[PDB]
Design an enzyme around this catalytic site. Structure first.
Site, PDB file in Angstrom:
ATOM      1  N   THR A 247      33.761  53.274  51.202  1.00  0.00           N
ATOM      2  CA  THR A 247      34.086  53.611  50.241  1.00  0.00           C
ATOM      3  C   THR A 247      33.387  54.964  49.860  1.00  0.00           C
ATOM      4  OG1 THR A 247      33.234  51.160  50.063  1.00  0.00           O
ATOM      5  CG2 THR A 247      32.414  52.805  47.765  1.00  0.00           C
TER       6      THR A 247
ATOM      7  N   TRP B 127      28.352  30.453  37.088  1.00  0.00           N
ATOM      8  CA  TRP B 127      29.569  30.350  36.917  1.00  0.00           C
ATOM      9  C   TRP B 127      29.801  29.852  38.901  1.00  0.00           C
ATOM     10  CZ3 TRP B 127      33.050  33.964  40.292  1.00  0.00           C
ATOM     11  CH2 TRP B 127      32.185  34.918  40.923  1.00  0.00           C
TER      12      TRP B 127
ATOM     13  N   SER C 222      42.639  56.095  40.970  1.00  0.00           N
ATOM     14  CA  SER C 222      43.207  57.657  42.092  1.00  0.00           C
ATOM     15  C   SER C 222      44.513  58.078  41.191  1.00  0.00           C
ATOM     16  CB  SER C 222      43.799  56.665  43.487  1.00  0.00           C
ATOM     17  OG  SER C 222      42.744  56.701  43.673  1.00  0.00           O
TER      18      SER C 222
ATOM     19  N   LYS D 114      36.458  57.204  49.696  1.00  0.00           N
ATOM     20  CA  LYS D 114      36.941  57.357  48.241  1.00  0.00           C
ATOM     21  C   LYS D 114      36.589  58.332  47.290  1.00  0.00           C
ATOM     22  CE  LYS D 114      39.617  53.822  46.973  1.00  0.00           C
ATOM     23  NZ  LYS D 114      40.608  54.096  47.531  1.00  0.00           N
TER      24      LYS D 114
ATOM     25  N   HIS E 154      32.930  36.793  47.727  1.00  0.00           N
ATOM     26  CA  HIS E 154      32.875  38.024  48.529  1.00  0.00           C
ATOM     27  C   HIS E 154      34.332  38.917  47.392  1.00  0.00           C
ATOM     28  CE1 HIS E 154      31.557  41.882  48.577  1.00  0.00           C
ATOM     29  NE2 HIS E 154      32.449  42.493  48.611  1.00  0.00           N
TER      30      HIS E 154
ATOM     31  N   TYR F 251      35.662  42.158  45.337  1.00  0.00           N
ATOM     32  CA  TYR F 251      36.285  43.035  45.496  1.00  0.00           C
ATOM     33  C   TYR F 251      38.256  43.425  45.479  1.00  0.00           C
ATOM     34  CZ  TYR F 251      32.486  44.943  48.309  1.00  0.00           C
ATOM     35  OH  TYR F 251      31.440  45.024  48.966  1.00  0.00           O
TER      36      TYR F 251
ATOM     37  N   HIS G 102      30.530  33.401  30.078  1.00  0.00           N
ATOM     38  CA  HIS G 102      31.193  34.248  29.707  1.00  0.00           C
ATOM     39  C   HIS G 102      32.054  34.884  30.630  1.00  0.00           C
ATOM     40  CE1 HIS G 102      29.968  38.452  29.840  1.00  0.00           C
ATOM     41  NE2 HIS G 102      28.840  37.980  31.322  1.00  0.00           N
TER      42      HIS G 102
ATOM     43  N   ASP H  69      63.266  44.625  40.125  1.00  0.00           N
ATOM     44  CA  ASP H  69      62.431  43.254  39.232  1.00  0.00           C
ATOM     45  C   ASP H  69      61.161  43.688  40.938  1.00  0.00           C
ATOM     46  OD1 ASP H  69      61.179  40.938  38.121  1.00  0.00           O
ATOM     47  OD2 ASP H  69      62.435  41.663  36.777  1.00  0.00           O
TER      48      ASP H  69
ATOM     49  N   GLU I  95      36.637  38.236  45.636  1.00  0.00           N
ATOM     50  CA  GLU I  95      36.901  38.101  44.743  1.00  0.00           C
ATOM     51  C   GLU I  95      36.368  39.552  43.869  1.00  0.00           C
ATOM     52  OE1 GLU I  95      38.694  36.310  42.790  1.00  0.00           O
ATOM     53  OE2 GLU I  95      38.670  37.196  41.001  1.00  0.00           O
TER      54      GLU I  95
ATOM     55  N   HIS J 116      24.917  37.682  52.219  1.00  0.00           N
ATOM     56  CA  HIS J 116      24.291  38.423  51.465  1.00  0.00           C
ATOM     57  C   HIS J 116      24.159  38.040  49.541  1.00  0.00           C
ATOM     58  CE1 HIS J 116      28.058  41.363  50.409  1.00  0.00           C
ATOM     59  NE2 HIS J 116      27.927  40.193  49.393  1.00  0.00           N
ATOM     60  N   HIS J 117      24.170  36.491  49.579  1.00  0.00           N
ATOM     61  CA  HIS J 117      24.687  36.070  48.323  1.00  0.00           C
ATOM     62  C   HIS J 117      23.174  34.530  48.725  1.00  0.00           C
ATOM     63  CE1 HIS J 117      27.698  38.202  46.711  1.00  0.00           C
ATOM     64  NE2 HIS J 117      27.893  38.409  47.198  1.00  0.00           N
TER      65      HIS J 117
ATOM     66  N   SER K 134      48.320  30.529  40.629  1.00  0.00           N
ATOM     67  CA  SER K 134      48.582  31.147  39.626  1.00  0.00           C
ATOM     68  C   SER K 134      48.512  32.349  40.109  1.00  0.00           C
ATOM     69  CB  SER K 134      48.294  31.296  38.227  1.00  0.00           C
ATOM     70  OG  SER K 134      48.270  32.102  37.954  1.00  0.00           O
ATOM     71  N   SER K 135      47.562  32.811  40.982  1.00  0.00           N
ATOM     72  CA  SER K 135      47.354  33.767  42.025  1.00  0.00           C
ATOM     73  C   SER K 135      47.375  33.654  42.912  1.00  0.00           C
ATOM     74  CB  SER K 135      45.287  33.681  41.976  1.00  0.00           C
ATOM     75  OG  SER K 135      45.888  34.432  40.208  1.00  0.00           O
TER      76      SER K 135
ATOM     77  N   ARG L 259      17.116  35.289  36.226  1.00  0.00           N
ATOM     78  CA  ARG L 259      18.064  35.628  35.432  1.00  0.00           C
ATOM     79  C   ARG L 259      18.754  33.747  34.854  1.00  0.00           C
ATOM     80  NH1 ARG L 259      22.917  36.425  40.066  1.00  0.00           N
ATOM     81  NH2 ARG L 259      24.290  35.644  38.157  1.00  0.00           N
TER      82      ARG L 259
END
Ligand code: HEA
Ligand code: HEA
Ligand code: CU
Ligand code: CU
Ligand code: CU
Ligand code: MG
Ligand code: NA
Ligand code: ZN
Lengths: 43, 514, 261, 79, 58, 227, 84, 47, 98, 84
Positions: free
Chosen positions: B316, B126, B255, B319, B240, B244, B61, B91, B242, B290-291, B156-157, B438
């Site tokens: 944040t 994950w 926006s 924004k 982390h 954001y 998932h 392009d 990732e 923090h994880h 790829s990324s 969890r």
């Protein structure tokens, strides 16, 4: 956003069918598997 | 020729479209997987039979939604379609390489699907932490297939990031500075930088997990002097950033949407807005631990990480307040897209505040690994990323297709989804505070009510996605072509009509150096 | 759909991306077949299609630039950014390995003797072959620079000569490193010390080979006059990459060979 | 001289959540003291302290494996 | 050697409607076909392996 | 432990957990404030026909919305860190107990004087005597003297596990090759439950922890009866 | 140590040619001389079955799955001790 | 090149018949949603 | 020693590269590599926007530090004004004559 | 830690102004907040007449020749111990 009128308008009936087909394609395959969960679990 | 056009493309539009199709499909897989999760938890007892299948499901998932749905759609889809159009480019900088970024995705997906089919699949979470992910507790090709899927996705990324940054920096009208590019473009440039720097650390990390499983190395095995915690540091150093990376393109889209439907020429505080994304991008690289608050790190470093994590709320906040300031005095059009954007603003705020609670290492001791964190990230991802994706989709759909959606059905769709997701995740805050862990396939009787309501909410959302499939059908079936579009003066992507020709900006725009 | 009035390059539809993507699928699953069902066929097929793809993709890039003249100044500038950005991600890749090393060596675990190097490990002497390798690579940093200048000044013989020296020096490093691998009294299976040592220098070793063939390519392109005294991006990138490889080695040397032993 | 021992007290050398070294060190120290006092014809009753401490903190399994290692002479620590 | 770059410029600039990966002649075509064949063949081969491994084969 | 239809934290059994309840009340107060403010503003913005679509000056209000949140964060952080330091605070324990996670059960070791060791498995729902909690009962509870500072050392012999007990405010991962320390202290006798808090495989949901707190006197006899 | 060879360690292909043959290459010869007027042979280390070495959690996918890739019998013992 | 342009022409699937489209879309998203369920089944059927 | 032997651009550059190379010498910019200098933008001194067709998109950065560029299609015909500042722009034929 | 704030950390006085006020100065305020939400007072250290400290091989050419230049009575003991 403005648009021309539908070139090939989908009447309410057509929509009803389209909606029915869609839901079914999502619910049938999953229902089949789920319904038979026991048949698999028992091994 | 279907081939030359769809398999050998070098056109940013066609590639963008390919990404939206892939991402749409992946989302169905991910949605199905999310339902099996709630199905199992919708009633005390066990449904799937063996909890390893549950774990395999929970894992898949996560990978599907993150790597195969959100990123391809946001970056590969909206990125390729809009970026060149917003800066008047013909392009991307490397159109051939761009095509490989896309084609690496189906293989990558295949490998992930293969991992859950061979052996007993990868029920590692994950985070795929060792030893559980090691060759002892998870013997077999599964974890290795999962690692390879990730390698391909990474490649790829990374290649994508290089393209976007080069493009955005090198291919603007000679007179246009970076401080004149629209916010979405900035949002995708900053995201590209984050991908470029974080993905390689992940690649290093999972390569080490791979050699531990197959080449007898012991990076993470204490037996050889390794340390399972080392994995955590490398994984989350990527992890982390990732999260954001999953929301920044969304900040960009929101926006544009809020500005457009308020009838403004530009968003409020454009530079404060650019500043905010850079800051979030920057701070997002120094808060990873923090994880790992229950892992056993020195108290002083835990104090540092909670302190650092909290400052992210300042940029944040500017924004969130700038979006509201943009609505101020606007001539508001209550379009589907605007609805999605208002939902995002609120839901994201809830999910973000909840993350501030979790930033406290002291309090995180008792919240870590409970459903309270599952509630947090589902607010910012399922109602953040996804809501932006939907708003962006209904808003630009006419530009991509040349056809319009039935606005009423779209609003119906929003209403349903709005109920489904809240019913699904709000209750989970309770579960966490009260202690439900969890990654559990069953729970002590006391947690029955909330898990029941929650699984029910999940079916509502199911209805909403089925409905959405129909909505796209009807638009294509009815064929109402677009005539005129509002506010083109400040929205370049629309200037070439809907849909824009295969080749746009064959002759560059003209911008004076006043 | 008129005559373009911008300086960028619109590339012809190409099958290489598809082919390269498929190659990646073949290699990864081929590695999966090798590691678990002891077979190399898939991996072999994968390796082959990969070379074919790289060969043809880069062949076209040459055709498009040297032969069709599509690399206008705007296009080159783009290529520079792409190369740099690429190198940057490679740096971060290697950073993961240095992190692992420092993590293990700075806090040696009880199961290792609670000391670094672990008890039972006989590290190589940094004043022997490792010093040699260091001097070989830095020396090639110097010769490649002479090559570059000969090129900008239009000196074909010296550019070829300097480029040749650089290449033999890189080849020489590979051979020396291969010998060391063989002579080493510890292996990759010798705990975190052997793990750390062989994947970090192994990957670097792999980059030295990639850099060498890149230079070899530049060599031949020069033999055939592809480079002009002002337009030679293929070479500049070859050189930047070579310096990157050079620098990474310096860090391995100081961290793993010197300090770490 | 303590045998009015309740449990290993706070040790400033190992002040953080990770106590891995605390066990290890005391295990080492003991066997080193034991060896010295046995090798110079003396009393091992001095080495007691360490055994109590390492005994309190070290997991049974760790202590077992380390002992086995020392027996076969593959104990990595320098005793 | 000798500078025959100008001659190759002409061959590749020749308006023959061929995409660059084939514009070089008949060999480009065989390479192309060889590559595509191996890729597709190998891909089929891997799918097969995936299948075999999918089921407990022991 | 948790009761049906519970909303907040389980009642506090120790002093730090009490501290946390209050700290969380404090933080939640603030999140309610902010989230209600944001909703009111959003509704304010969307309820008027008055328009002002021309440009507005950026900077002016940006300072309020930067300085204010900075102050609010300091108000959450100070307390947070105070408690954070308390939890690690230099405690002088009168007993040390070790627990080792294993693939699907916890084993405990009290070795200050004796060599007392035992495994602790979940009692299958089909062997539950009436009145027993479904996935929470363990056959051999971990008995400890109430009102004393115990030192717990957590580790594991296989994969990662996490030893947690909500009511006491504890959660310390169990990592192979590592000994993590936490400080337990209960201010009441009773039974307190917790569950494995790190995915450890197929039976990660079935390896609870039950603490039994009784007076010292009864702890000692129990020690001896367990060998 | 330190460094300072007068000037001209920059600008001119002649200069870099000068550095290539007058400094770089000679350094390589010296290090080669050294690395050969020192490199003889380390007596093979006494074998002691430490558990943190010769790790085998999964057999190598080649040969007999018990020999590392660049296995050198003279210096690399198997988990059971030296080969021959 | 000479690729077609305009509404319903910049896509890899034909949108000329709404009912054939209904079918393709159904297969498309359908197969996507279906996959996880069959994998779970496949796993339950090995043991 | 010296020698030569490596070709120069002047002698080997081909295609578009050469075209922009040559065009650059005569002070021209057919490939829009450089930013156009603005005139006064009045009705009598409008910005002359070269185009190879009968319309080109114009982006007007009305004031030096504006974040928003005002975009619009300039057509063959009389001078049009920026919807925001009124600056005048007039289409003119590009050097490649349609 | 590491770093990566999107792009534009080079070229344009506006960019460096942007970095000056958006990154540099704010860092200074944070470190100022920290250096003041921490900096209180270290209790003056116990005086013990170590011989390798409070060195006096020749009297300072100022004052009474026994007080260092920035002598702080609260924290700097003379060789004989604290002053007052
Ligand atoms: C879209 C992705 C996304 C985003 C943007 C965020 C944003 C945040 N997240 Fe979260 N988070 C995740 C997704 C995300 N997160 C995921 C996937 C995980 C779990 C991973 C796993 O373990 O599987 C996770 C888990 C996670 C943890 C781990 C907890 C644990 O495992 O025990 C922590 C810890 O601090 C955290 C905190 C934060 C913080 C502080 C923010 C901040 O960025 C939020 C800032 C936003 C606001 C603060 C609201 C708006 C601001 C205002 C209106 C101004 C006023 C505010 C104040 C003054 C307070 N998140
Ligand atoms: C993007 C991220 C994402 C999204 C969207 C979701 C969506 C959902 N997730 Fe999430 N989930 C995660 C990522 C995500 N999840 C992660 C990281 C974890 C942790 C895994 C771990 O512990 O290892 C997790 C775990 C997780 C758990 C915990 C499992 C456990 O601890 O045992 C639960 C349980 O309820 C859950 C449920 C849901 C549900 C009901 C949805 C529902 O919202 C699904 C409803 C459908 C949608 C909301 C999206 C529909 C959108 C589209 C179809 C695209 C449309 C396309 C175009 C227009 C182009 N997820
Ligand atoms: Cu994080
Ligand atoms: Cu467990
Ligand atoms: Cu568990
Ligand atoms: Mg955890
Ligand atoms: Na269940
Ligand atoms: Zn203007």
């Amino acid at each position: 956003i403005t648009a021309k009128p539908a070139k090939t308008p989908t009447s309410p009936k057509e929509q009803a069918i389209g909606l029915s087909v869609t839901f079914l394609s999502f619910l049938l395959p999953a229902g089949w598997v789920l319904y038979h969960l026991d048949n698999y679990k028992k091994s | 020729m279907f081939i030359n056009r769809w398999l050998f493309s070098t056109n940013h539009k066609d590639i963008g479209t390919l990404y939206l199709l892939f991402g749409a499909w992946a989302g169905m897989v991910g949605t199905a997987l999310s339902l099996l999760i709630r199905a199992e938890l919708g009633q005390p007892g066990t449904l799937l039979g063996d909890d390893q299948i549950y774990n395999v499901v929970v894992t898949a998932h996560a990978f599907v939604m993150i790597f195969f749905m959100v990123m391809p759609i946001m970056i590969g889809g909206f990125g390729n379609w809009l970026v060149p159009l917003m800066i008047g480019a013909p392009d991307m900088a490397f159109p051939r390489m761009n095509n490989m970024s896309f084609w690496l995705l189906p293989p990558s997906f295949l490998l992930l699907l293969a991992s859950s089919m061979v052996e007993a699949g990868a029920g590692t979470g994950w985070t795929v932490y060792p030893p559980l992910a090691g060759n002892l507790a998870h013997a077999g090709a599964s974890v290795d297939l999962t690692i390879f899927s990730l390698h391909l996705a990474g490649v790829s990324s990374i290649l994508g990031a290089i393209n976007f940054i080069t493009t955005i920096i090198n291919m603007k009208p000679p007179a246009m500075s970076q401080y004149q590019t629209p916010l979405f473009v900035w949002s995708v440039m900053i995201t590209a930088v984050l991908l470029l720097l974080s993905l390689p650390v992940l690649a290093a990390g999972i390569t080490m997990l791979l050699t531990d499983r197959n080449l007898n190395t012991t990076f993470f095995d204490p037996a050889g002097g390794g340390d399972p915690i080392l994995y955590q540091h490398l994984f989350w150093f990527f992890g982390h950033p990732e999260v954001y990376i999953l929301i920044l393109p969304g900040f960009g889209m929101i926006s544009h949407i809020v500005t457009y439907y308020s009838g403004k020429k530009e968003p409020f505080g454009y530079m404060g807005m650019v500043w905010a994304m850079m800051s979030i991008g920057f701070l997002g690289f120094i808060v990873w631990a923090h994880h790992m608050f229950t892992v056993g790190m020195d108290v002083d470093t835990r104090a540092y990480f909670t302190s650092a994590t909290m400052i992210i709320a300042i940029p944040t906040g500017v924004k969130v307040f700038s979006w509201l300031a943009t609505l101020h005095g606007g001539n508001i059009k209550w379009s589907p897209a605007m609805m999605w954007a208002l939902g995002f603003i609120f839901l994201f705020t809830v999910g973000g505040l909840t993350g501030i609670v979790l930033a406290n290492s002291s309090l995180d001791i008792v919240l870590h690994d409970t459903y309270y964190v599952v509630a947090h990230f589902h607010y910012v991802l399922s109602m953040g990323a996804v809501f932006a994706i939907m708003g962006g989709f209904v808003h630009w759909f006419p530009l991509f297709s040349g056809y319009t959606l039935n606005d009423t059905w779209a609003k119906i769709h929003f209403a349903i989804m709005f109920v489904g997701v809240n019913m699904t995740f709000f209750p989970q805050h309770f579960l966490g505070l009260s202690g439900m862990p969890r990654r559990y396939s069953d729970y002590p009787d006391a947690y029955t009510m909330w898990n029941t309501i929650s699984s029910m909410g999940s079916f509502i959302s199911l209805t909403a996605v089925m409905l959405m499939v129909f909505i796209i059908w009807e638009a294509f079936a009815s064929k109402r072509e677009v005539l005129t579009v509002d506010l083109t003066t400040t929205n370049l992507e629309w200037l070439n009509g809907c849909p824009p020709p295969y080749h746009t900006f064959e002759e560059p725009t003209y911008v004076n150096l006043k | 759909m008129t005559h373009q009035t911008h300086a960028y390059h619109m590339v012809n539809p190409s099958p290489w991306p598809l082919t390269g993507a498929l190659s990646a699928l073949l290699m990864t699953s081929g590695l999966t077949m090798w590691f678990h069902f002891n077979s190399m066929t898939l991996l072999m097929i994968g390796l082959t299609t990969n070379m074919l793809t790289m060969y043809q993709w880069w062949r076209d890039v040459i055709r498009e630039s040297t032969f069709q003249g599509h690399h206008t100044p705007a296009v080159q500038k783009g290529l520079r950014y792409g190369m740099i950005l690429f190198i940057i991600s490679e740096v971060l890749f290697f950073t993961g390995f240095f992190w692992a090393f420092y993590h293990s060596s700075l806090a040696p675990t009880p199961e290792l003797g609670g000391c670094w190097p672990p008890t039972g490990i006989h590290p190589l002497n940094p004043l022997e072959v490792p010093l040699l390798n260091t001097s070989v690579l830095l020396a090639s940093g110097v010769s490649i620079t002479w090559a570059h200048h000969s090129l900008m000044e239009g000196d074909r013989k010296h550019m070829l000569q300097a480029l040749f020296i650089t290449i033999t020096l890189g080849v020489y490093f590979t051979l020396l490193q291969a010998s060391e691998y063989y002579e080493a009294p510890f292996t990759i299976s010798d705990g975190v010390y052997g793990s750390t040592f062989f994947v970090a220098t192994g990957f670097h070793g792999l980059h030295v080979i990639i850099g060498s063939t890149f230079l070899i390519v530049c060599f031949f392109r020069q033999l055939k006059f592809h480079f002009t005294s002002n337009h030679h991006f293929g070479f500049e990138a070859g050189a930047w990459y070579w310096h990157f490889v050079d620098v990474v080695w310096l860090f391995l040397y100081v961290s793993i060979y010197w300090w770490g032993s | 001289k303590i045998k009015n021992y309740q449990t290993a007290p706070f040790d400033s050398r190992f002040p953080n959540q990770n106590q891995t070294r605390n066990c290890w060190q005391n295990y080492l120290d003991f066997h080193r003291c034991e060896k010295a006092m046995t090798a110079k014809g003396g009393d091992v009753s001095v080495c007691e302290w360490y055994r109590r401490v390492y005994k309190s903190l070290c997991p049974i399994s760790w202590v077992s494996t380390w002992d086995d290692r020392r027996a076969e002479g593959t104990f990595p620590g320098k005793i | 050697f000798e500078n025959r770059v100008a001659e190759k410029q002409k061959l590749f600039q020749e308006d023959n409607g061929l995409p660059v990966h084939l514009k070089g002649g008949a060999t480009d075509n065989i390479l192309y076909r060889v590559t595509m064949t191996l890729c597709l063949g190998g891909t089929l081969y891997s799918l097969y392996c995936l299948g075999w491994a999918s089921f407990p084969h022991k | 432990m948790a009761y049906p239809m519970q909303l907040g934290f389980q009642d506090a059994t120790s002093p730090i957990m009490e501290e946390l309840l209050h700290f969380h009340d404090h933080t939640l107060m603030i999140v309610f404030l902010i989230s209600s403010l944001v909703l009111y503003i959003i509704s304010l913005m969307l309820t008027t026909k008055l328009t002002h679509t021309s440009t507005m000056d950026a900077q002016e209000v940006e300072t309020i919305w930067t300085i204010l949140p900075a102050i609010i964060l300091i108000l959450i952080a100070l307390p947070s860190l105070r408690i954070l330091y308390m939890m690690d605070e230099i405690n002088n324990p009168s007993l040390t107990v070790k627990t080792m996670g294993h693939q699907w059960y916890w084993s405990y070791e009290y070795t200050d004087y004796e060599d007392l060791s035992f495994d602790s498995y979940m009692i299958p729902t089909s062997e539950l005597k009436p009145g027993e909690l479904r996935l929470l009962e363990v056959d051999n509870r971990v008995v400890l003297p109430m009102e004393m500072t115990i030192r717990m050392l957590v580790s594991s012999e296989d994969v990662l596990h996490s030893w947690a007990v909500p009511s006491l405010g504890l959660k310390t991962d169990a990592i192979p090759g590592r000994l993590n320390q936490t400080t337990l202290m209960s201010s009441r006798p009773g039974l307190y439950y917790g569950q494995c808090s790190e995915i450890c495989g197929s039976n990660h949901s079935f390896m609870p922890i039950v603490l039994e707190l009784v007076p010292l006197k009864y702890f000692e006899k129990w020690s001896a009866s367990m060998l | 140590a330190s460094a300072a060879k007068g000037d001209h360690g920059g600008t001119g292909a002649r200069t870099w040619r000068f550095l290539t043959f007058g400094l770089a290459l000679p350094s390589v010869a010296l290090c080669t001389l050294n690395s050969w007027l020192h490199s003889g042979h380390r007596e093979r280390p006494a074998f002691i079955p430490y558990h943190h070495l010769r790790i085998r959690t999964k057999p190598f996918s080649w040969g007999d799955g018990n020999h590392t890739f660049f296995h050198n019998p003279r210096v690399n013992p198997l988990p059971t001790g030296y080969e021959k | 090149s000479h690729y077609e342009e305009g509404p319903g022409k910049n896509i890899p699937f034909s949108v000329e018949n709404k009912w054939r489209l209904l079918a393709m879309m159904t297969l498309f998203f359908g197969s996507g949603f279906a996959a996880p369920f069959f994998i779970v089944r496949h796993q339950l059927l090995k043991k | 020693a010296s020698g030569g032997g490596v070709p120069t651009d002047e002698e080997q550059a081909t295609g578009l590269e050469r075209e922009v190379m040559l065009a650059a010498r005569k002070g021209q910019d057919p490939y829009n590599i450089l930013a156009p200098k603005a005139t006064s933008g009045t009705k009598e001194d409008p910005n002359l926007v070269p185009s190879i067709t009968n319309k080109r998109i114009v982006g007007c950065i009305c004031e030096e530090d504006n974040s928003t560029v005002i975009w619009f299609w300039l057509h063959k015909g009389e001078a049009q004004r920026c919807p925001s500042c009124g600056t005048h722009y007039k289409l003119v034929p590009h050097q490649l004559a349609h």
